Design a protein around this ligand. Structure first.
Ligand SMILES: *[C@@H]1O[C@H](CO)[C@@H](O[C@@H]2O[C@H](CO)[C@@H](O[C@@H]3O[C@H](CO[C@H]4O[C@H](CO)[C@@H](O)[C@H](O)[C@@H]4O[C@@H]4O[C@H](CO)[C@@H](O[C@@H]5O[C@H](CO[C@]6(C(=O)O)C[C@H](O)[C@@H](NC(C)=O)[C@H]([C@H](O)[C@H](O)CO)O6)[C@H](O)[C@H](O)[C@H]5O)[C@H](O)[C@H]4NC(C)=O)[C@@H](O)[C@H](O[C@H]4O[C@H](CO)[C@@H](O)[C@H](O)[C@@H]4O)[C@@H]3O)[C@H](O)[C@H]2NC(C)=O)[C@H](O)[C@H]1NC(C)=O
Ligand SMILES: *C[C@@](*)(O)[C@H](CCCNC(N)=[NH2+])NC(=O)[C@@H]1CCCN1C(=O)[C@H](N)Cc1ccccc1
Ligand SMILES: [K+]
Ligand code: NA
Lengths: 33, 259
DNA sequence: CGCCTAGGTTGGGTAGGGTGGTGGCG
């Protein structure tokens, strides 16, 4: 069985959850353009 | 990680460290996908040509870390393994095809600001994000250089490293090496003409190659550090286990039992 | 008190820190 965590997966407590961007994710996002 | 940089605290809360009990040594990277499942590369646990073949009791896994060697009191969390599941068609004889493994913890871990799971991709996530030119992120406490030959600089970082790299066109990957490539693999890194640098290296295997969905803002693990030829060499690209191509096996194992 | 660098399942970054309690020196 999977267990706990699926619903909230991929959202970091110290970033997405506090609406803060790590120093380099921007580079990632921009690569999709 | 070659030509990467220090990670920020809690930047990769799904990062896991595969650690050998005795002697105490860091073996590989891994990733947290739930409170009781961890994903890593198969060769980290089983590689006959090098006499490698660990079992559940030989290892322990360490979650929430940043520093490679310090024991991070009140922050990190250590868990023993209940079971290890190597993909049954993991090809260690030739090219590491299906270089993937699932490890079940004995006791479910509690999440925290430093411990949180990454999402596994589905068909849409893969179609939309796994495209040549898009960038993903690799993390690990692996080597800062090819340590098997004389080179300047430290061998290991003191802190978790991170590097962003673009996915590369499959034909390029294929022509970059003489080792047989499969659809269960993808390669990533900069081309010589792009003038930028970065790659995973020995000790990084099992670590995740994650991508952020611009659509739902979540982090998805698309690959697993599997292999390479040298580290950060021009015309070479790091190879990663294709997670979504192996999703059926993964879910088959994770959902198998009601425990 | 203000500095200095330190065990421990552990460095020195500093005696908090992304964590708990804990020196020795002038
Ligand atoms: C890397 O290193 C590893 C680590 O060492 C190494 O592992 C070795 O691999 C060898 C293969 O070459 C293998 O050999 C075997 O050993 C047999 C005896 O060992 C088994 O029993 C002893 C003690 O009795 C244990 O100490 C061993 O761990 C081993 O246990 C067996 O393990 C297998 C695989 O995990 C189990 O299969 C799984 O079973 C699951 C279901 O489990 C139950 C169940 O129904 O719930 C549990 C029940 O207890 C059991 N019931 C009973 C009554 O026992 C049932 C029941 O067995 C079945 O249901 C009925 O079939 O199973 C799932 O089904 C799952 O899918 C399945 O994979 C297995 O259950 C378990 N058995 C028991 C009883 O617990 C030898 O007998 C065997 O002999 C064979 O070859 C001989 C010819 O040379 C021939 O004489 C003989 O008749 C056989 O054909 C052979 O020597 C080693 O056992 C194994 N060592 C260890 C320590 O694991 C890797 O190989 C190595 N890898 C590489 C690539 O290098
Ligand atoms: C186990 C992992 O730490 C490691 C990751 C290497 C990543 N390298 C780069 N440049 N991104 N994997 C390995 O060391 C694997 C396992 C066995 C040998 N190996 C290699 O990558 C060899 N250098 C090449 C290779 C040999 C045999 C089969 C596949 C690849
Ligand atoms: K301390
Ligand atoms: Na390269």
């Amino acid at each position: 069985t999977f267990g706990s965590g699926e619903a909230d997966c991929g959202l970091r407590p110290l970033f997405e959850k506090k609406s803060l961007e790590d120093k380099t994710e921007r580079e990632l996002l921009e690569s999709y353009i | 990680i070659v030509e990467g940089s220090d990670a920020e605290i809690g930047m990769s809360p799904w990062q896991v460290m595969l650690f050998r009990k005795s002697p105490q040594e860091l073996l590989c990277g891994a990733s947290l996908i739930s409170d009781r499942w961890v994903l890593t590369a198969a060769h980290c646990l089983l590689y006959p040509p090098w006499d490698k073949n660990f079992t559940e009791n030989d290892l322990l896994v360490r979650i929430g870390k940043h520093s490679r060697t310090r024991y991070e009191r009140n922050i990190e969390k250590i868990s023993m393994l209940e079971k290890i599941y190597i993909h049954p068609r993991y090809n260690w004889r030739e090219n590491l095809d299906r270089d993937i493994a699932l490890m079940k913890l004995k006791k479910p871990v509690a999440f925290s600001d430093y411990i949180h799971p990454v999402c596994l991709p589905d068909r849409e996530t893969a179609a939309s994000l796994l495209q040549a030119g898009y960038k993903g992120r690799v993390t690990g406490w692996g080597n800062l250089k090819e340590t098997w030959t004389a080179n300047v600089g430290k061998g290991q970082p003191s802190v978790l490293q991170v590097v962003n790299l673009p996915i590369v066109e499959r034909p390029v990957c294929k022509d970059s090496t003489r080792i047989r490539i499969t659809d269960n693999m993808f390669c990533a890194g900069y081309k010589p003409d792009e003038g930028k640098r970065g790659d995973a290296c020995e000790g990084d295997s099992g670590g995740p190659f994650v991508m952020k969905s611009p659509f739902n803002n979540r982090w998805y693990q698309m690959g697993i550090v599997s292999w390479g030829e040298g580290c950060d060499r021009d015309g070479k690209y790091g190879f990663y286990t294709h997670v979504f191509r192996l999703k059926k096996w993964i879910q088959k194992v994770i959902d198998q039992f009601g425990e």
